[PDB]
């Protein structure tokens, strides 16, 4: 008999109930086949007893002894079937067979046997490209992929493990109201979009093209991550905020229990000092809710107190400095949009027949470039911009028609000073113009000012820019480029790469929780009248704006060197270690990012050749070829006609594709995600909406800018009630769960039996530790203070690879996990 140990976790996170005839396992041979060439299968073997011997056992886990009859005619086990005859599902961790050691890493929920169309199968931890699969496992390997793909029909159930694609046709709620109808995103030239995971709930009764509402948005079962500690279930907080907390806040405002608007900046600071007083029944709603109860300190009676945002921990006024406004474009929440400006004035590609004359109104001789002429600044590569003009202009008219929204399409010009810091030198606030226009508001240029009403107008100009930047950050840099862009690759990977496949093992840690958070976001974040639409400027146009931006999304430009070169913030330079020379030498995001990028590249370049010796080996891997074909032609199918997709016929193409996927999922998402509350937890620093244009001279609103500048500012930016909701959301999303798995870590040390792959992975984790030491030295270097810390004195730690749990402003998860 072969001695085995099963480790599992009961659903409650009673052990005698697993004995008797409750759980059967059957070993499957990798070497002895039946007459059809399929590995022979052993007898049903039941769990025999509880193993209390090994002190090495994670929380919630139990170990069971089992002995398998396995004679000569059976060969070597390479897989097993398991049947759960119990009513309730359990979480299967592993099987370990001794003195034959063979390890099986399972980490999968096993529901009652009657719920499955075919018996659950698990493979030992060996790694095989398809031409290396032992012959008696070839059919089992392919049948398991066929099972995962399903047939493209049916309402998906909680226990299903079926991966497939669908369009974003589940955000509208047209059965509730015509006002809640939304365009389908994906599957048309008007609205191209990445695909998402298919749920199959079926059509609404009013629109056959929109998917009906559902209490639970399915994800394949093992994508729905359980947590030992309920506080770690951060993705569910989004749902609780929308469904329970937001209505409670709304009630406090409807009943006039708290002022409707902030009246001074101190009313905003109060949120993390003394707190806000709210009705008792409002506090009583929050206090018992998992995740939500961690967001606020409370007296249990009437007070909620938000945590002090990092950006104010040293100076509560530094966010208002021009130095910090520009520094955040290279070391802030959204450090990836600034571009070099190589001509002046800046140009627009938009049609003047639609929007009016698009010539810039910024004059060169009005700009203070520290004594440089414009030609000198351009030539020395010292001029940059944050350009939202062409991005926002197409939507300004329809946004400004909404009752409580008004924006400009902004452009900010920045100068790289000789001291190496950026300074803002002008903001252009543009509006579309057409013959029939009812509005008399005009475009204007605003220049820096420190005194008088001109200083208030300049501070407001910065707020209009940061509203554009916050909307672009959240919808494009963050949602579109990480969450949404990655999901098609998750789906393709499970559909086409076996668990046995080396590239499955390389990529899947980088998908942890991504389908789950995305489904929860379709339900409560980006749904019609959901949190994003009611907190961000574009309202009901928000998600469709991300579709318009996706028209220009380029997979190969997500690589960090290509991004930097495309934006004109670095140049190709083969004499440099990273192959690019930064044009802003101390650009903290890019400088730290290049280190992480290089480490991932080395890991991928070391792992790939362990499994692929020539370009032909890549061409000849049928799972890999099917995977990439489907990811492109189905998952990102609206961009299938584009010439820039890698072909995947060479080793270098495989490395490139894997490298870009891991970068997007880990460091890029971390850099755009974990600064959300640290920088945006002060709404004045990261306003999410603007509600009025600049006032005309001779009006009470203009006199208010002179006499009460803080009120003028607060009336312009996000109102108090959506601010309380936005702050709560971003606090959740900026938190690391205690069970996170970070870059350089895996959830199990035995993910492969291949020692060379294990060694290469250890080298990768060591290199990340080395890199963190280097980044600490950078933050401690007084010469780099201006960009790495700024007047907010906030060291740039967002690309430190490691972190403890909580709202830490550091740490790079493997995946898009929140
Ligand atoms: Fe995120």
Curated annotation (Swiss-Prot):
Pfam families: Lipoxygenase (PF00305), PLAT (PF01477). Plant lipoxygenase may be involved in a number of diverse aspects of plant physiology including growth and development, pest resistance, and senescence or responses to wounding. At pH above 8.5, only (9Z,11E,13S)-13-hydroperoxyoctadeca-9,11-dienoate is produced, but as the pH decreases, the proportion of (9S)-hydroperoxide increases linearly until at pH 6.0 it represents about 25 % of the products. One of its GO terms (biological process) is fatty acid oxidation. This is Seed linoleate 13S-lipoxygenase-1. Residues 10-124 form the PLAT domain. The gene is LOX1.1. Its EC number is 1.13.11.12. GO terms for molecular function: iron ion binding; linoleate 13S-lipoxygenase activity; linolenate 9R-lipoxygenase activity; oxidoreductase activity, acting on single donors with incorporation of molecular oxygen, incorporation of two atoms of oxygen. Binds 1 Fe cation per subunit. Iron is tightly bound. Residues 191-213 are annotated as: Disordered.
């Amino acid at each position: 008999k072969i001695k085995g140990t099963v480790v599992l976790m009961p659903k409650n996170e009673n052990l005698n109930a697993f004995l008797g005839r409750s759980v059967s396992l059957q070993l499957i041979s990798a070497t002895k086949a039946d007459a059809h060439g399929k590995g022979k299968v052993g007898k049903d073997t039941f769990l025999e007893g509880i193993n209390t011997s090994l002190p090495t056992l994670g929380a919630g886990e139990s170990a069971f002894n089992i002995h398998f009859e396995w004679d000569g005619s059976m060969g070597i086990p390479g897989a097993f079937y398991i049947k759960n005859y119990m009513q309730v599902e359990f979480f299967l961790k592993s099987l370990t067979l001794e003195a034959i050691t063979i390890r099986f890493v399972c980490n999968s929920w096993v529901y009652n046997t009657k719920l499955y169309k075919s018996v659950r199968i698990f493979f030992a931890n060996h790694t095989y490209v398809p031409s290396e699969t032992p012959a008696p496992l070839v059919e089992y390997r392919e049948e398991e992929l066929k099972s995962l793909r399903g047939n493209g029909t049916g309402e998906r159930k909680e226990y299903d493990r079926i991966y497939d694609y669908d369009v974003y046709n589940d955000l509208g709620n047209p059965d509730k109201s015509e006002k809640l109808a939304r365009p389908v995103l994906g599957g048309s030239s008007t609205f191209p979009y990445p695909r998402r995971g298919r749920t199959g709930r079926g059509p609404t009764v009013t629109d056959p093209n929109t998917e009906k509402q559902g209490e639970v948005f399915y994800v394949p079962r093992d994508e729905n991550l359980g947590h030992l500690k309920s506080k770690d279930a951060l993705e569910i907080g989004t749902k609780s905020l929308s469904q329970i907390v937001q209505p409670a806040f709304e009630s406090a405002f409807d009943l006039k229990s708290t002022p409707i608007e902030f009246h001074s900046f101190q009313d905003v600071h109060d949120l993390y000092e003394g707190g806000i007083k709210l009705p008792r029944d409002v506090i009583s709603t929050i206090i018992p809710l998992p995740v939500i109860k961690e967001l606020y300190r409370t007296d249990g009676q009437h007070i909620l107190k938000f945590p002090q945002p990092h950006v104010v921990q040293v100076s509560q006024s530094a966010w208002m400095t021009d130095e910090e406004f520009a520094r955040e474009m290279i070391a802030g929440v959204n450090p990836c949009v600034i571009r070099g400006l190589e001509e002046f004035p800046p140009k627009s590609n938009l049609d003047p027949a639609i929007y009016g004359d698009q010539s810039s109104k910024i004059t060169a001789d009005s700009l203070d470039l520290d004594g440089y002429t414009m030609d000198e600044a351009l030539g020395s590569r010292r001029l940059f911009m944050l350009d939202y003009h062409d991005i926002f202009m197409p939507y300004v008219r329809q946004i400004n028609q909404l009752n409580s929204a008004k924006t400009y399409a902004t452009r900010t010009i920045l100068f790289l000073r000789e001291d190496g810091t950026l300074k803002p030198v002008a903001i252009e606030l543009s509006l579309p113009h057409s013959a029939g226009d009812l509005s008399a508001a005009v475009s204007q240029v605003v220049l820096p000012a420190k005194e008088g009403v001109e200083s208030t107008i300049w501070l407001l100009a910065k707020a209009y820019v940061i509203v554009n930047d916050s909307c672009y950050h959240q919808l494009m840099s963050h949602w579109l480029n990480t969450h949404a862009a990655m999901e098609p690759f998750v789906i393709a990977t499970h559909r086409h790469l076996s668990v046995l496949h080396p590239i499955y093992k390389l990529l899947t840690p980088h998908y942890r929780n991504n389908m789950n958070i995305n489904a929860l976001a379709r339900q409560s974040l980006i749904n019609a009248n959901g949190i994003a639409e009611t907190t961000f400027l574009p309202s009901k146009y928000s998600v469709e704006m991300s579709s318009a931006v996706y028209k220009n999304w380029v997979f190969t430009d997500q690589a960090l060197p290509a991004d930097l070169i495309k934006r004109g913030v670095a140049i190709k330079d083969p004499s440099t270690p990273h192959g690019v020379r930064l044009l802003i030498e101390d650009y903290p995001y890019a400088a730290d990012g290049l280190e992480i990028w290089a480490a991932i590249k080395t890991w991928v370049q070391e792992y790939v050749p362990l499994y692929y010796a020539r370009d032909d080996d890549v061409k000849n891997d049928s799972e890999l070829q099917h995977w990439w074909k489907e990811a492109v032609e189905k998952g990102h199918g609206d961009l299938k006609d584009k010439p820039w997709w890698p072909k995947l016929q060479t080793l270098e193409d495989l490395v490139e594709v894997c490298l870009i996927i891991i970068w997007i999922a880990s460091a890029l998402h971390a850099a755009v995600n974990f600064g959300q509350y640290p920088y945006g937890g002060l709404i004045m620093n990261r306003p999410t909406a603007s509600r009025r244009l600049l006032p005309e001279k001779g009006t009470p609103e203009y006199e208010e800018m002179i006499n009460n500048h803080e009120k003028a500012y607060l009336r312009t930016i996000t109102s108090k009630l959506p601010t309380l909701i936005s702050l709560s959301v971003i606090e959740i999303l900026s938190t690391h769960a205690s069970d996170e798995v970070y870059l350089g870590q895996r959830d199990n040390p035995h993910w492969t039996s291949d020692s060379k792959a294990l060694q290469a992975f250890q080298k990768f984790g060591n290199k990340l530790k080395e890199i963190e030491e280097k980044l600490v030295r950078r933050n401690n270097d007084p010469s780099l203070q201006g960009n790495r810390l700024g007047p907010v004195q906030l060291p740039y730690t967002l690309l430190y690879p490691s972190s403890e749990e909580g709202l830490t402003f550091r740490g790079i998860p493997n995946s898009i996990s929140i």
